[PDB]
UniProtKB/Swiss-Prot annotation, chains A, B, C, D, E, F, G, H, I, J:
Location in chain, cross-link Glycyl lysine isopeptide (Lys-Gly) (interchain with G-Cter in ubiquitin): K6, K12, K16, K26, K38, K42, K48, K64, K70
Protein name: Microtubule-associated protein tau
Lineage of source species: Eukaryota, Metazoa, Chordata, Craniata, Vertebrata
Each Tau/MAP repeat, start to end: 1-31, 32-63
Role played: Promotes microtubule assembly and stability, and might be involved in the establishment and maintenance of neuronal polarity. The C-terminus binds axonal microtubules while the N-terminus binds neural plasma membrane components, suggesting that tau functions as a linker protein between both. Axonal polarity is predetermined by TAU/MAPT localization (in the neuronal cell) in the domain of the cell body defined by the centrosome. The short isoforms allow plasticity of the cytoskeleton whereas the longer isoforms may preferentially play a role in its stabilization.
Annotated positions for site Not glycated: K6, K12, K16, K26, K35, K38, K65, K70
Transmembrane intervals: none
Effect of S47L: In fatal respiratory hypoventilation; unusual apparent autosomal recessive inheritance; reduced binding to microtubules as well as increased fibrillization and aggregation
Full-sequence portion shown in this chain: 623 to 695 of 758
Length: 73, 73, 73, 73, 73, 73, 73, 73, 73, 73
């Protein structure tokens, strides 16, 4: 049994931008309420209860490259 | 048995942009309410209960490349 | 048994844009309410209960490339 | 048994745009209500209950390319 | 059994940006309240209860590259 | 006397090709026989005498652009 | 006398190729025989006498751009 | 007399190639025989007499750009 | 007399290649026989007599840029 | 007389290559026989007589840039 794994990657993910500009994030404040009582969490539990998130994300390029290789035998 | 795996990738994902411009995110605030009582979560549970999300995402290119390779035997 | 896997990819996903311009996201605030009582979640459960999402997404190109390879034997 | 897999891809997915222009997303706020009681979810359940989504998505090209390869034996 | 794993990667993820510009994050303050009583958490539990997050994230390029290799036998 | 020589060239010479295939150059061998006595070559003489050439030229595009610009007085 | 020589060149000579394949150059061998007595070469004489050439030239693009710019008085 | 020589060159000569493959240069051997008596070479004489060449040239792009700029009085 | 020689060059000569493969240079051996009596070479004579060359040239890009700039009075 | 010689060069000669592979240079051996009596070489004579060369040249890019700048009176 001979297995040869030799992929070749010369790719690119790119961007160019002159300027981004004026970005205004100004939401009115809101109200979030949760009236639960019992929260018993177990065994791989990911939980967000009752939240207010104000997020401004402005990268000067937010390019992503995800690459996965796998050889099993 | 001879297996040769040699894919070749010279591709590109790209963008160019002169400017983005003036971006205004100004939603009226809202109200979110949850009146649940028992939240027993277990064994691979992903949960978001009761939330208000104000998100501005303005990348100067948000290009993505996802590549997966897999050889089993 | 001889298996040769050698695909070739010289492709591109691209965009060009002069400017994006003035983008106004200004929804009236709304109201979201959930009156449930028991939420027992288990074994690979993905759940969003009671939410208000205000999202502005304005990438200067949001091009995507997804590529999957698989050889089994 | 000889198997040769060598597809060739020199394709492109592209766009050009002078400007996008003025985009106004201004829906009146609405009301969403759910009066359920028992939500027992299990074993690969994807669920969205009671939501209000205000989404503005304006990419400067949102071109996509999806490519899948598969060789079984 | 001979296994040769020699992938080659000469790729790049990059961005260029003239300036980002004036970014204004000025949300109205909101209110978040949780009225739960029992939070017994165990065995791999990730939890955020009752929060207000004001985040401004403005990298001068926030490009990411994630690469995974795996050979099993 | 005002001349102003300003030609503008924004041209392209291009090609795309999936595959160049199988090229087999297998001519039978031949014979070249040349008899002479006196070779008197003077003043910018260029010559090839008695020769045998087997040439395989297989470029992945052999595009050419040739230009001459001449201005005199 | 004002001349102003300012040609502008923004041209491209390009190619793309997936694969250059299988090139087989296998000519039979031949014979070259040259008989002479006197070779009198003077003043910029260039010559090739009695020769055998087997040439394989297989570039991954052999694109050329040649230009001449000449101004005289 | 004002000349002003200012040509502008923003050109590109480029290529992309996935793979250059399998190149087999296997000519049969040959014979070159040259007979002469007197070789009298004078004043810028360039010559090649009696030769056998086997050349394999396989560049990963053999792109060339050649230019000449000449101004005289 | 004012000359002003200011050519501007922002050009590129480039290439990309995944793999240069398998190059086999295996010519049969040959024979070169040269007979002469008198070789009288004078004044800038360049010569090659009686030779056999086997050359394999396989660069990972053999791109060239050649330029000449000449100004005279 | 004012000359002002100021050419500007911002050019690039470049290459990228994943792999240069397997290069096999295995020519059969040959023979070179040269007979002469008198070699009279004078005044800038350059010569190669009776030679056999086996050359393998495999650079990871063999890019060249050559330029000449000459100004005279």
């Amino acid at each position: 049994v001979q297995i040869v794994y030799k992929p070749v990657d010369l790719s690119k993910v790119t961007s160019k931008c002159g300027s981004l500009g004026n970005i205004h994030h100004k939401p009115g404040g809101g109200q979030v309420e949760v009236k639960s009582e019992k929260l018993d969490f177990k065994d791989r539990v990911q939980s967000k209860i009752g939240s207010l998130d104000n997020i401004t994300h402005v990268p000067g390029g937010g390019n992503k490259k995800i690459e996965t290789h796998k050889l099993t035998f």
